[PDB]
Design a protein around this nucleic acid. Structure first.
Ligand SMILES: [Mg+2]
Ligand SMILES: [Mg+2]
Ligand SMILES: [Mg+2]
Ligand SMILES: [Mg+2]
Ligand SMILES: [Mg+2]
Ligand SMILES: [Mg+2]
Ligand SMILES: [Mg+2]
Ligand SMILES: [Mg+2]
Ligand SMILES: [Mg+2]
Ligand SMILES: [Mg+2]
Ligand SMILES: [Mg+2]
Ligand SMILES: [Mg+2]
Ligand SMILES: [Mg+2]
Ligand SMILES: [Mg+2]
Ligand SMILES: [Mg+2]
Ligand SMILES: [Mg+2]
Ligand SMILES: [Mg+2]
Ligand SMILES: [Mg+2]
Ligand SMILES: [Mg+2]
Ligand SMILES: [Mg+2]
Ligand SMILES: [Mg+2]
Ligand SMILES: [Mg+2]
Ligand SMILES: [Mg+2]
Ligand SMILES: [Mg+2]
Ligand SMILES: [Mg+2]
Ligand SMILES: [Mg+2]
Ligand SMILES: [Mg+2]
Ligand SMILES: [Mg+2]
Ligand SMILES: [Mg+2]
Ligand SMILES: [Mg+2]
Ligand SMILES: [Mg+2]
Ligand SMILES: [Mg+2]
Ligand SMILES: [Mg+2]
Ligand SMILES: [Mg+2]
Ligand SMILES: [Mg+2]
Ligand SMILES: [Mg+2]
Ligand SMILES: [Mg+2]
Ligand SMILES: [Mg+2]
Ligand SMILES: [Mg+2]
Ligand SMILES: [Mg+2]
Ligand SMILES: [Mg+2]
Ligand SMILES: [Mg+2]
Ligand SMILES: [Mg+2]
Ligand SMILES: [Mg+2]
Ligand SMILES: [Mg+2]
Ligand SMILES: [Mg+2]
Ligand SMILES: [Mg+2]
Ligand SMILES: [Mg+2]
Ligand SMILES: [Mg+2]
Ligand SMILES: [Mg+2]
Ligand SMILES: [Mg+2]
Ligand SMILES: [Mg+2]
Ligand SMILES: [Mg+2]
Ligand SMILES: [Mg+2]
Ligand SMILES: [Mg+2]
Ligand SMILES: [Mg+2]
Ligand SMILES: [Mg+2]
Ligand SMILES: [Mg+2]
Ligand SMILES: [Mg+2]
Ligand SMILES: [Mg+2]
Ligand SMILES: [Mg+2]
Ligand SMILES: [Mg+2]
Ligand SMILES: [Mg+2]
Ligand SMILES: [Mg+2]
Ligand SMILES: [Mg+2]
Ligand SMILES: [Mg+2]
Ligand SMILES: [Mg+2]
Ligand SMILES: [Mg+2]
Ligand SMILES: [Mg+2]
Ligand SMILES: [Mg+2]
Ligand SMILES: [Mg+2]
Ligand SMILES: [Mg+2]
Ligand SMILES: [Mg+2]
Ligand SMILES: [Mg+2]
Ligand SMILES: [Mg+2]
Ligand SMILES: [Mg+2]
Ligand SMILES: [Mg+2]
Ligand SMILES: [Mg+2]
Ligand SMILES: [Mg+2]
Ligand SMILES: [Mg+2]
Ligand SMILES: [Mg+2]
Ligand SMILES: [Mg+2]
Ligand SMILES: [Mg+2]
Ligand SMILES: [Mg+2]
Ligand SMILES: [Mg+2]
Ligand SMILES: [Mg+2]
Ligand SMILES: [Mg+2]
Ligand SMILES: [Mg+2]
Ligand SMILES: [Mg+2]
Ligand SMILES: [Mg+2]
Ligand SMILES: [Mg+2]
Ligand SMILES: [Mg+2]
Ligand SMILES: [Mg+2]
Ligand SMILES: [Mg+2]
Ligand SMILES: [Mg+2]
Ligand SMILES: [Mg+2]
Ligand SMILES: [Mg+2]
Ligand SMILES: [Zn+2]
Lengths: 50, 87, 126, 70, 50, 206, 119
RNA sequence: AUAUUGGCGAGAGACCGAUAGCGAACAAGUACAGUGAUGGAAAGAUGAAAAGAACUUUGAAAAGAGAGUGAAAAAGUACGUGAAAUUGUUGAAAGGGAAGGGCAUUUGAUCAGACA
RNA sequence: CGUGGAGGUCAGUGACGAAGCCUAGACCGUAAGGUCGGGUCGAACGGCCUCUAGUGCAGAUCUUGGUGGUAGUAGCAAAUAUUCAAAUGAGAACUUUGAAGACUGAAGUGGGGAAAGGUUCCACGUCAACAGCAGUUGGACGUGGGUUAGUCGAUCCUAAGAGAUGGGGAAGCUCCGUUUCAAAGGCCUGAUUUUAUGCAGGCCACCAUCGAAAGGGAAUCCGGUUAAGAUUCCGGAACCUGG
RNA sequence: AAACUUUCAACAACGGAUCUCUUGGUUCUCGCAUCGAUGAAGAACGCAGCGAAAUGCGAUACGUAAUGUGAAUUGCAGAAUUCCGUGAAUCAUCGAAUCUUUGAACGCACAUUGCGCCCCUUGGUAUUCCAGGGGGCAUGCCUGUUUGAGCGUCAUUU
């Protein structure tokens, strides 16, 4: 980075967005089954291979 | 020092993202994707790689269009509009 | 026993078809028999349960009680009666969920269509 | 909002498909306002932002709470 | 791999024969439709025989 | 057929202080390293995986099916055998039970049941019904859920409505004389069904 | 509310173009509001509304073109039937029913006769 | 008339029953490894119903103790049953470089029967 | 003898408690095993005659999973170093502030960048896990804000090299060739004053394209400003390219 | 004598066997013949009042049109005019549409949101420069149209 391509920025941006906890009201829905965000992700725990 | 101290220079991509399959398998110097074959007009696959095949066949995706063909067929590819009735 | 080549007594096939039926289908599944009074009155045995119908539980604990259906909770395969409720320990109230096959219809809400429905089952109406 | 009080600049999230020209005209046309220059940038959530500076004929702050926000 | 006074066999199974096994499970079904087919044909063919 | 076998697992050979079953390749996943293919491995493949070309049907000499069916028919007289077989017949007038050909023409369940009662089938019919239990097996969730006894088996000469008038009452079976099945004549290979023969049917026998 | 389509379809080509702008002004404004109120579902029913109008506008323009082509070789590929790629290249019923000069003579002279055994 | 481990639609089984059955009954070709080709998991069950524990009390809190709900809390979102290895407490007993075992009986503990 | 399924039967057992598990209690059998009581439990299950097999485990450096002894043990000892007080907080060896003692000693433990990472930046909130003592602190958790360009880079150029095209090989996936055995193209203005662009000169035969954020290359500086941006904002003063 | 060790049990731990479940898997059978330059399969990025997935969709974005049904949706908020009705709905059906960036993928490129050309139109005192809106330009091959090339070659000029 520093000087990145718009493709990579985009990818990085989409990744920012997916990186939030389970929105706690899903937990309330009928038959809801999701306890937490299983596909979460940390910058120093898992590199996103571009 | 073929081990770790040599590992420390690992910081240049050999493959980037591949347009056609988005896979980080697009070999930069070779300018071809090691997964799907782009830009080879045909998509890369092999019969010794059935698991791979399965990972990418029709149906693994949206079928944005094929979805609807069987319904369309079911109705003899009808054209026009539905009319009206009562209740 | 089944005799058609297009019906299936396969249990697994049935249970899925139940639980995964669409809102539209649940409407008919959530039928509720008419009251003796109402049956002889429209000549109909039962009806898919409308909302603002008037009803009487004839099974379970809430047996005997009556009220207006407040919502048909199709998602839950369950019906709610405005008047049949739980009061939690903290005094807040909660609707008890009722199965329409355990109610009886005591007054229909009536539409052009609802009448029409009754007419169609070879019924008659007051 | 600071830019809008102190800088006489309207700030908009603005189409990623649109260039500095198109932001200029569209603002111009949507708001009666006249526009001096238009800096743009791509936010890190992948949406584009226009810093839009009005000429000193217009008071953007005034303009802002005409468009309705405060 | 030779012993006892047994006859000599010639059981030709050294190719991948498990790949080319036809079990006529469909024996009853093919009869049915065979019968069904003749039934439509008689129908179709007006009064001619079959 | 391809199960347990969907892996590129190689063995690690000896010298690695661990047994030699093939092991899943690669890493980062815990599946990786695990024993493969072997019939004793979790996720393995079964020993001698079942095939469809196993034999399922059996060929009986045609003449011997008849020896059996005949034999079987003969037992449906012998009242003690019928008795031994389940089948409440202390009350029935005489065996073989022959009943009027009028039976064959009855077209209404209620009416048909009525007849069956009248001629002595009551207590056997009631024996089914009183007998319906939940299949004890896992069978009970492979479309084999309930269980119950065999009723009487009504042989007729001409279906003038009868097979239909009965097709709903528990345990009663019907059979055109001209057929006659060993499976119905001696259910579970025990001789002596309770048969109610119409006259018509009885005379055709011969 | 939410605009009705069968009500749109009687409005003029431009009484419709305008209504589309009004909604756009509204919807725009609504979004200015959205970032003050904690919830603004009213917005949903006006972005659906816009779809509806646009639909009707594109709808009537197509029926326009579609007619002023009706009945002639060559009309724009996207008014041509969809069917199937293959279905499209199938022989037409005519060029398929086609029968050789000497064949029809034969078909005429000796066709399959309705007959019957027994008697 | 023949073929069909693909596709769309259907009826079935002396099939498997969550370490089984397809790798996947679950946000599974996912998560995760690998430069890449490729590799590739684990993971179902509160209850009829959330009625998911108001209120008090100790606590910084988590929680504990009461209360309360419920057919049951010996069901408390660690949730049906809840084995074993292995562990804590309580009770009983034995132990001079292992422990366990066989025949026999003392002693302690425990118990069936049979009596009229 | 024992298991999973199947035909028959006992109109078998059961929510008034099926199955399962527990039990140095009872009884039958030489034995495989079978039977009962009590506890736990909560929806099913068994006897007999037959049928059937994915039908019986202590071992296979067996497979998966779970668990011990080892053991509160080895250990947590490289990189000179810590100290007093206040503040905060339930809580302070470790957070903040002040004081002191030191260190790195411009070949830096300073001030920036290229690759790589992708929000770690900044603020607010905050300690369940994580930071092999701790934690009130953090690159953690929660919630948010933040990356402004005619002049900085890219973009243009060409380098090794890559690589379409007429073609020539190859059964074919494709291999060769890069101006090659090709009918390979676009420019300046006149001709227009039906009218917009046909024909009038003449050139020019170059013969794709990709390939440099260190090579080449049009042009911006200072001052001020932010929690976090700045040769990018604001201020002033310039310069380049096209028109 | 205790601690300690060991054995049995009771309660409580650990662990998740067992039993019972099953919207799944497997296998058999029957019926059927429908992808794509009218842009398929596949990819990327986006779209909800409050979503990160899965599912759905495409800037008309968990959807538009139509048709059937006949009152829901539901975790909360909401509409409230949607209830004897051209009408609820995360309904069903589906014949009409919209369908971002792409992909055989087609103006040229592509580790670039990189760089041309043509037509229409609008704005900027503009046939030439800049900017907005629309519509276009790959390859091989077939039939045809038109414009042509070759002393390949016929005839006709005076
Ligand atoms: Mg790693
Ligand atoms: Mg390389
Ligand atoms: Mg290459
Ligand atoms: Mg290509
Ligand atoms: Mg009905
Ligand atoms: Mg219910
Ligand atoms: Mg001001
Ligand atoms: Mg910029
Ligand atoms: Mg052979
Ligand atoms: Mg061999
Ligand atoms: Mg077959
Ligand atoms: Mg024939
Ligand atoms: Mg095999
Ligand atoms: Mg070892
Ligand atoms: Mg397996
Ligand atoms: Mg069992
Ligand atoms: Mg039974
Ligand atoms: Mg028969
Ligand atoms: Mg609507
Ligand atoms: Mg066509
Ligand atoms: Mg079948
Ligand atoms: Mg499994
Ligand atoms: Mg598995
Ligand atoms: Mg399931
Ligand atoms: Mg995981
Ligand atoms: Mg469980
Ligand atoms: Mg539940
Ligand atoms: Mg408590
Ligand atoms: Mg009870
Ligand atoms: Mg209990
Ligand atoms: Mg319980
Ligand atoms: Mg709780
Ligand atoms: Mg359970
Ligand atoms: Mg438990
Ligand atoms: Mg003792
Ligand atoms: Mg002894
Ligand atoms: Mg046995
Ligand atoms: Mg058995
Ligand atoms: Mg079995
Ligand atoms: Mg024991
Ligand atoms: Mg006893
Ligand atoms: Mg008991
Ligand atoms: Mg029990
Ligand atoms: Mg239960
Ligand atoms: Mg046997
Ligand atoms: Mg098994
Ligand atoms: Mg075995
Ligand atoms: Mg053994
Ligand atoms: Mg073992
Ligand atoms: Mg052994
Ligand atoms: Mg072992
Ligand atoms: Mg310790
Ligand atoms: Mg130590
Ligand atoms: Mg050390
Ligand atoms: Mg020390
Ligand atoms: Mg040190
Ligand atoms: Mg210290
Ligand atoms: Mg020094
Ligand atoms: Mg020095
Ligand atoms: Mg340091
Ligand atoms: Mg820096
Ligand atoms: Mg990083
Ligand atoms: Mg953030
Ligand atoms: Mg920080
Ligand atoms: Mg803590
Ligand atoms: Mg850390
Ligand atoms: Mg620590
Ligand atoms: Mg700690
Ligand atoms: Mg954060
Ligand atoms: Mg420059
Ligand atoms: Mg450029
Ligand atoms: Mg080449
Ligand atoms: Mg270049
Ligand atoms: Mg450069
Ligand atoms: Mg340079
Ligand atoms: Mg400065
Ligand atoms: Mg700022
Ligand atoms: Mg900075
Ligand atoms: Mg300036
Ligand atoms: Mg100036
Ligand atoms: Mg100039
Ligand atoms: Mg003493
Ligand atoms: Mg206990
Ligand atoms: Mg089980
Ligand atoms: Mg159940
Ligand atoms: Mg099945
Ligand atoms: Mg079939
Ligand atoms: Mg594909
Ligand atoms: Mg959704
Ligand atoms: Mg909604
Ligand atoms: Mg209508
Ligand atoms: Mg739908
Ligand atoms: Mg659109
Ligand atoms: Mg291209
Ligand atoms: Mg582009
Ligand atoms: Mg031509
Ligand atoms: Mg010509
Ligand atoms: Zn690819």
């Amino acid at each position: 980075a520093a000087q990145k391509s718009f493709r990579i920025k985009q990818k990085m941006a989409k990744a920012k967005k997916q990186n939030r906890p389970l929105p706690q009201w899903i937990r309330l829905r009928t038959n809801n089954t999701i306890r937490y965000n299983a596909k979460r992700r940390n910058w120093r725990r898992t590199k996103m291979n571009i | 020092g073929k081990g770790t101290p040599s590992f420390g220079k690992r910081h240049n991509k050999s493959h980037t993202l591949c347009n056609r399959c988005g896979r980080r398998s697009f070999h930069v110097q070779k300018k071809t994707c090691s997964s799907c074959g782009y830009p080879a007009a045909k998509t890369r696959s092999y019969n010794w790689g059935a698991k791979a095949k399965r990972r990418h066949t029709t149906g693994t995706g949206r079928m944005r269009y094929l979805k609807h063909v069987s319904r369309r067929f079911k109705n003899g590819f009808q054209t026009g509009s539905a009319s009206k009735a009562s209740a | 026993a089944k005799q058609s080549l297009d019906v299936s007594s396969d249990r697994r096939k049935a249970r899925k078809a139940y639980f995964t039926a669409p809102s539209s289908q649940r409407r008919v599944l959530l039928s509720a028999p008419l009251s003796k009074e109402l049956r002889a009155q429209y000549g109909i045995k039962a009806l898919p349960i409308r909302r603002d119908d008037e009803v009487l539980v004839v099974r379970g604990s809430k047996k005997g009680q009556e009220g207006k259906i407040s919502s048909v909770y199709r998602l839950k395969f369950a019906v709610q009666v405005d008047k049949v409720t739980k009061e939690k320990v903290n005094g807040a109230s909660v609707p008890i969920n009722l199965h329409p096959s355990k109610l009886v219809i005591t007054k229909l809400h009536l539409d052009k269509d609802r009448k029409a429905l009754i007419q169609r089952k070879g019924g008659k109406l007051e | 909002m600071k830019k809008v009080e102190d800088g006489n600049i309207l700030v908009f999230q603005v189409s990623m498909k649109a260039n500095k020209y198109q932001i200029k005209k569209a603002v111009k046309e949507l708001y009666e306002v006249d526009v001096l220059k238009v800096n743009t940038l791509v936010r890190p959530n992948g949406t584009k932002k226009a810093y839009v500076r009005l000429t000193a004929d217009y008071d953007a702050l005034d303009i802002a709470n005409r468009i309705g926000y405060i | 791999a030779i012993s006892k006074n047994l006859p000599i066999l010639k059981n030709h199974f050294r190719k991948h024969w498990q790949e080319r096994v036809k079990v006529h499970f469909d024996q009853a079904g093919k009869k049915v439709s065979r019968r069904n087919a003749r039934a439509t044909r008689a129908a179709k063919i007006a009064p001619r025989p079959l | 057929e391809k199960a347990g076998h969907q892996t590129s697992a190689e063995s690690w050979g000896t010298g690695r202080a661990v047994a030699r079953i093939p092991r899943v390749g690669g890493g980062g996943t815990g599946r990786s390293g695990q024993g493969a293919f072997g019939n004793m491995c979790r996720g393995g493949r079964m020993f001698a995986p079942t095939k469809t070309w196993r034999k399922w049907n059996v060929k009986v000499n045609h003449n011997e099916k008849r020896y059996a069916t005949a034999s079987a028919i003969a037992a449906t007289a012998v009242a003690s055998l019928v008795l031994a077989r389940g089948h409440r017949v202390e009350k029935i007038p005489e065996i073989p039970l022959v009943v009027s050909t009028d039976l064959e023409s009855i077209q209404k369940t209620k009416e048909a049941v009525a007849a069956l009662k009248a001629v002595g089938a009551h207590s056997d019919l009631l024996k089914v019904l009183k007998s319906k239990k939940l299949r004890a097996g896992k069978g009970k969730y492979r479309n084999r859920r309930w269980t119950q006894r065999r009723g009487p088996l009504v042989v007729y000469a001409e279906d003038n409505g009868i097979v239909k008038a009965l097709r709903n009452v528990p345990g009663v079976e019907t059979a055109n004389v001209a057929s006659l099945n060993l499976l119905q004549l001696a259910p579970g290979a025990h001789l002596g069904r309770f048969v109610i023969w119409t006259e018509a049917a009885f005379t055709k026998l011969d | 509310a939410g605009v009705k389509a069968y009500e749109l379809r009687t409005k003029s080509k431009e009484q419709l173009a305008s209504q589309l702008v009004d909604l756009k002004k509204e919807l725009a404004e609504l979004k200015v509001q959205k970032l003050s109120r904690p919830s603004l579902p009213k917005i949903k029913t006006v972005r659906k509304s816009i779809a509806c109008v646009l639909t009707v506008i594109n709808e009537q323009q197509r029926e326009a073109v579609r007619q002023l082509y009706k009945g002639k070789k060559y009309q724009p590929k996207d008014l041509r039937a969809k069917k199937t790629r293959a279905l499209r290249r199938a022989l037409t019923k005519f060029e398929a029913s086609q029968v050789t000069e000497k064949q029809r003579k034969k078909q005429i002279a000796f066709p399959q006769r309705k007959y019957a055994i027994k008697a």
